[PDB]
Design an enzyme around this catalytic site. Structure first.
Site, short mmCIF file in Angstrom:
data_model
loop_
_atom_site.label_atom_id
_atom_site.label_comp_id
_atom_site.label_asym_id
_atom_site.label_seq_id
_atom_site.Cartn_x
_atom_site.Cartn_y
_atom_site.Cartn_z
N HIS A 90 -0.06 6.79 -2.74
CA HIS A 90 0.98 5.81 -2.49
C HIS A 90 1.37 5.17 -3.81
N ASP A 142 3.28 1.86 -6.13
CA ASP A 142 3.04 0.45 -6.35
C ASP A 142 4.34 -0.33 -6.15
N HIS A 192 1.15 7.47 -7.34
CA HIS A 192 -0.23 7.54 -7.79
C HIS A 192 -1.16 7.97 -6.66
N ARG A 224 -17.97 2.67 -8.29
CA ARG A 224 -17.15 2.31 -9.43
C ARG A 224 -16.27 1.12 -9.08
#
Lengths: 219, 219
Positions: free
Chosen positions: A148, A150, A200, A210
């Site tokens: 998706h 931004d 992205h 992480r």
């Protein structure tokens, strides 16, 4: 004035002692990168990768996030969103809860803005960010997000852990550019547009967890 | 209903008979370009050039603009804008004075939007426009504009005359990409972002008069 009711009072000391806080928290190559001596990497088109944060600041932020404990997020609905429906869910702690939203905004207006001004000529920056949070992904709690875009003019992604040593897996996967950043840097950060020309996609992590600190600026 | 109070009344018949307007105003190659068989050109990254309209539509629009007479613009301030100050003056007339602004918005929502969705995957468009005017560029009246950005998510540029035979000059120069538009096509249209990653400066016309179509989409 010094807030003693905090694990790391020096983290909020940016207002009282900007010089000392900047020297202790920022990356050693931040000044060199800003001066224009290379350092900044562009593995993908219309992308950047420069060293912004240091080990001490990242460790302090991770400790504060771990001390916060209430790692909310992961539901389709959103309690902190006006609309009440989040298109993409993620397990994260908002900067508003920790109270670091003002400090993060000040740091972005001080250091992040000059970097965007230098990297993109003819572009003026005001450092207006409405969403700022740090997300921790685990092999069994939060998986890799769906591909998706931004909802902002520019997106900044800053890692908070060492690749392999802290978490095992990969980074991003830019479908448009067919590029995957499989070698994230703990001290470096990326600042590329994500509105229209960037769909992205994040890669999955097998072992370990992480932590990623990403904020949506200019929305 | 057929209001004859126009030099070319069929220009406002976009809603009465959509099939007739599409068959007598749009470019014949527009269907092929929308079908996804080439036609669309990519001279520079994140830049598109494909045919949009037919020669008859361009000629009728030019005749209507000439009959309008009130080709204002050229001062730093303005009266059409709510703020009252214009960043870049230009001798152009908004379609609101002409009255075909609704027709232009309908055309954008009917043809432009699906092409943008096909060109840029994953982006949902509603075809919302605010600033849209036809600017006639003449060396003796209005020279080229200095480099700047567009206060919109996307910018659409459409030629309204045959280059060379009707005017002598140049097109646009991409400062950040070293992309120069040297041979614009009357039927083809320019589609690229103009907010952050692209700063464009138009070339100066020398002989004749250059007519261009400007429209700020998704501001």
């Amino acid at each position: 004035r010094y807030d003693t009711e905090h694990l790391h009072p020096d983290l909020w000391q940016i207002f009282d002692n900007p010089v000392d806080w900047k020297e202790q928290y920022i990356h050693e190559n931040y000044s060199r990168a800003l001066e224009g001596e290379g350092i900044v990497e562009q593995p993908c088109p219309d992308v950047y990768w420069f060293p912004l944060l240091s080990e001490q600041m990242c460790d302090e932020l991770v400790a504060e996030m771990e001390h916060y404990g209430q790692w909310s997020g992961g539901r389709h609905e959103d309690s902190r969103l006006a609309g009440g429906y989040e298109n993409v869910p993620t397990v994260d702690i908002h900067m508003k809860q920790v109270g670091y939203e003002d400090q993060w905004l000040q740091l972005l207006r001080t250091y992040v803005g000059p970097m965007t001004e230098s990297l993109f000529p003819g572009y003026h920056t005001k450092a207006r960010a409405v969403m700022n949070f740090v997300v921790r992904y685990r092999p069994d709690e939060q998986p890799s997000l769906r591909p998706h875009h931004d909802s902002s003019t520019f997106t900044l992604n800053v890692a908070l852990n060492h690749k392999g040593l802290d978490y095992e897996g990969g980074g991003c996967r830019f479908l448009r550019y067919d590029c995957v950043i499989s070698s994230p840097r703990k001290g470096w950060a990326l600042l590329h547009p994500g509105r229209l020309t960037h769909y992205h996609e994040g890669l999955p992590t097998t072992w370990g967890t992480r932590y990623i600190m990403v904020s949506f600026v200019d929305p």
